[model samples]
Target: VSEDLKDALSTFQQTFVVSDATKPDYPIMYASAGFFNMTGYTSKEVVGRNCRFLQGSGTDADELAKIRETLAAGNNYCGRILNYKKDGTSFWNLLTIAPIKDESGKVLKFIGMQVEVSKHT
Candidate 1:
């Protein structure tokens, strides 16, 4: 992608609502800007982090497993999952993840979007 595309997406992330994901022990990655504000984290604090950080002891393993399966298959995923915020509060999110691929269909990156479907307060 061009720098302009990247810049545009960054701006969109800042203005739009989205969600965060993690990569094991790394910093969290906020896929959208709306998520950054909602969860009270900046884009820097989230990028390269694992989504599991949003999960707690009570997090649903089964649902996560399903998500793994779907993503591994390189298919788009649209499902509702229980996710958490930075403060350990829980909310149900309508999560959608799709793989961005190269012209040869090789998966390059992931695009994940999440919307809060339930009221946490």
Candidate 2:
């Protein structure tokens, strides 16, 4: 990919990159500026934290179970979840997560793409 294209894609919203595959819990390595804008949190606050911070009292357990199952099976997941912002405001999260694998088929990281769909229905 060209550097220009890389730069362009880096600005995409609701995206995060996680690392430390060998760890019990994967920690966020990078959060896109778009995610920062949507969640009202800076990269410093997001990095090293699990994405579950977005979940709140109203968030769905069944949907979270599905995500857990899919991740255990090493597959991608697409689901809608209720996620909370830093200010405790809730939004409908159109969430998708895919595994990033190495050439040997080892899972290295996970890339999550989220869209806050609170206003648009």
Candidate 3:
């Protein structure tokens, strides 16, 4: 990943929370600062863990599979996803994830954005 993109993501993370709720094993990962604050996890604690740990038995495997398939195919994925905060609280979120690619068309990383879908869903 380019330092520029990484830095941009860092900045974005500071303002908006990003989650891979689609991942089954561990799908609740986000940027260091946001993830840390939301989940009460230190950067050291979550730097390498998948985000799924945030779910409290409410995650859907089918949704996760669709997201995984889209990402694995190097395509952008956008949808309404149910996610949970660090404290195991749930929320519905509108998410957009786009693969960042180089000139050679190789996906190096993803750029994600999110917004809370509603107060009640």
Candidate 4:
């Protein structure tokens, strides 16, 4: 990211993550501070890892399947699902994932936004 974008978005409190589509596991390329606040994990730890690290035993099977199906079909996905924090806390994450594509319609990245529906968590 450029200095302009860093200065602009660093303090924004909306949790977001960017994943590289070219990577085998779609490892996170960047994660916002809001994501660090929510997950108790810094960008240094979050990057180079698949987003599935946030999932745990509390995550719903059907919701996972649905999310995969939706994204696999080249559509954006919006859903609320259980997600765990680094401290082993569970919360309902209202998540959205949109694919970033080039002019040729080839996927380059995925951007994910998350809102905590289980607000107290």
Which regions of candidate 4 fall more than 4 Å away from where they truly are? Answer: 1-13, 119-121
- Measured against the true structure, the TM-scores of the candidates, in listed sequence, are 0.69, 0.81, 0.61, 0.81
Pairs that collide in candidate 2 are none
Residue 56, model 2: lDDT of 98
Give per-model CA RMSD.
11.1, 8.9, 10.8, 9.1
Model 1 Cα RMSD, Å?
A: 11.1
lDDT tens per residue, model 2, 3-81: 6865565532465556445455667887877776878788777788788988999999999999878677777889889
- Per-residue lDDT, model 1, residue 28, is 37
Model 4, CA-based lDDT: 0.81
* lDDT at residue 37 of model 2 (Cα atoms): 82
Superposed model 2: Cα runs more than 4 Å off: 1-13, 119-121
Stretches off by above 4 angstroms in model 3 are 1-44, 119-121
Cα misplacement distance, residue 121 of candidate 2 (Å): 6.5
What value does the lDDT take at residue 67 in candidate 1?
A: 75
Ranked by lDDT from best down, the candidates are: 4, 2, 1, 3
Deviation of model 2 at 114, angstroms: 0.6
Supply candidate 3's per-residue lDDT for 36: 55
lDDT of each: 0.59, 0.76, 0.57, 0.81
Judging by TM-score, tell me the better candidate of 1 and 3.
Answer: 1
Candidate 3 residue pairs that clash = 26-51, 26-52, 27-51, 27-52, 28-51, 28-52, 29-51, 39-86
